[PDB]
């Protein structure tokens, strides 16, 4: 099930959802939360939706009339004429799935640094390398990622670190050692708390 993206909504409207069908090898490509980009064909699928006014029947074109005691009336007459409602709904039959805004230009089962590095083009990874060797990258990322927020340099640094996160570990006995930084921003009204959250979310 997908739904229309929030940049596409008309005024006053709830997002439209449609169910798309993936087949043989595209089958497991789209996961929940992904902004994906389906190419395929819009199709009708017979539906079960009635108790409305009857409409759009299909019956045989053979001119046929039941005899006394077998009159073409009621349930028997509808079964004999072979009448059935024509109810359809729109479904998308997708032959291919891809992200709308891809992260890399090189490829898209598991994730290791070398797998990521191969997944990207030579230009993209030379950029990645040259910022990895960049001194002052801490401040560079803080400024590049909250460009409109003045002050609050500590909050910028903390949020950036939370974005990178630590190393999750499991003890021998079984307890998991958390590796995710959680950050809370407490402050007076109109101090850009909601703005920090919006920056990260976008």
């Amino acid at each position: 099930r997908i739904q229309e993206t929030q940049a596409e909504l008309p005024r006053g409207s709830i997002p439209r959802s449609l169910e798309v069908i993936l087949r043989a090898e595209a089958v497991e490509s789209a996961q929940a939360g992904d902004k994906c980009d389906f190419t395929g064909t819009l199709i009708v699928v017979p539906d079960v939706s009635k108790l409305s006014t009857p409409g759009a029947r299909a019956e045989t074109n053979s001119r046929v009339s039941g005899v006394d005691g077998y009159e073409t009336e009621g349930i028997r007459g509808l079964r004999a004429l072979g009448v059935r409602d024509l109810s359809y709904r729109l479904v998308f039959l997708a032959c291919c799935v891809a992200p709308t805004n891809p992260r890399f230009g090189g490829k898209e089962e598991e994730q290791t640094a070398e797998s990521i590095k191969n997944q990207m083009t030579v230009k993209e990874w030379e950029k990645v390398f040259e910022m990895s060797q960049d001194k002052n990258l801490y401040h560079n990322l803080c400024t590049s990622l909250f460009p409109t927020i003045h002050g609050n340099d500590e909050v910028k640094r903390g949020v950036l670190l939370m974005l990178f996160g630590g190393v999750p570990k499991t003890t021998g006995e079984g307890t998991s050692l958390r590796g995710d930084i959680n950050v809370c921003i407490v402050g007076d009204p109109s101090t850009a708390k909601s703005q920090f959250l919006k920056h990260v979310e976008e």
Partner: protein, 238 residues
């Protein structure tokens, strides 16, 4: 037990020569005037006061209050038979249903064959071509009943109750006669509705589609059909 041809003559006689001095003391035929008004389609409802009937036939009022649905039908029959002889001009066809009635009447005249006896089903249902509706006003000699005490012993009887209205539905169209057309013949098919539900017809029964032994599937339509303003209320004991 009783003969309804004689009862129809009785109610015709009542409708034609009952008079009252209601019009400022002037003696008017109370129901003949209304027969005029609803023969020219200037009135729909005829409220037959049963106090008026009781002035000269209390046995009739007893019969009415004891069956009350046979007699509503009888009164509608009698007024429908009296209307042609009270019509003093030609109706202006204020309505769309009137056009259907006029076309059906004109076609029936056109293919009349007056001496030929047509099938009982080869006719217009009475309810399809009335345009008026007849109601009783209970005799005042009937004391009003209490909603609790209107029970199975008064099924079919005319009763009067009073209470608070608690709930009224919206006015919506109730099918009275469902009209169908066929895809082969050109005849109309009528299905008077008495039950709260009905199964729409499938095959047409007209003479031509029986002679031809053709398919003759028929199509339910609102345009020729008869609806009535319908409304359901709940009324409550005082």
């Amino acid at each position: 037990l009783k003969d309804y041809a004689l009862e129809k003559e009785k109610v015709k006689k009542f409708l034609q020569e009952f008079y009252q001095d209601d019009e400022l003391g002037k003696k008017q035929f109370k129901y003949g005037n209304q027969l005029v008004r609803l023969a020219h389609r200037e009135q729909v409802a005829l409220y037959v006061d049963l106090d008026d009937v009781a002035e000269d036939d209390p046995e009739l009022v007893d019969s009415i209050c004891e069956n009350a649905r046979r007699y509503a039908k009888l009164f509608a029959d009698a007024v429908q038979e009296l209307l042609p002889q009270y019509k003093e001009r030609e109706v202006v066809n204020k309505d769309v249903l009137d056009v259907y009635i006029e076309h059906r009447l004109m076609m029936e005249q056109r293919s009349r064959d007056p001496g030929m006896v047509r099938s009982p089903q080869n006719q217009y249902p009475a309810e399809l071509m009335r345009r008026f509706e007849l109601y009783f006003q209970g005799p005042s000699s009937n004391k009003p009943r209490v909603i609790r005490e209107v029970r199975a012993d008064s099924v079919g009887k005319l009763v009067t109750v009073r209470g608070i209205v608690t709930r009224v539905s919206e006015v919506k169209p109730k099918m009275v006669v469902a009209t169908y057309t066929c895809d082969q013949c050109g005849a109309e098919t009528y299905q008077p509705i008495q039950s709260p539900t009905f199964m729409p017809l499938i095959m047409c029964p007209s003479q031509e589609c029986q002679t031809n032994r053709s398919g003759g599937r028929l199509y339910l339509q609102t345009r020729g059909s008869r609806f009535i303003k319908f409304q359901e209320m709940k009324m409550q004991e005082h």
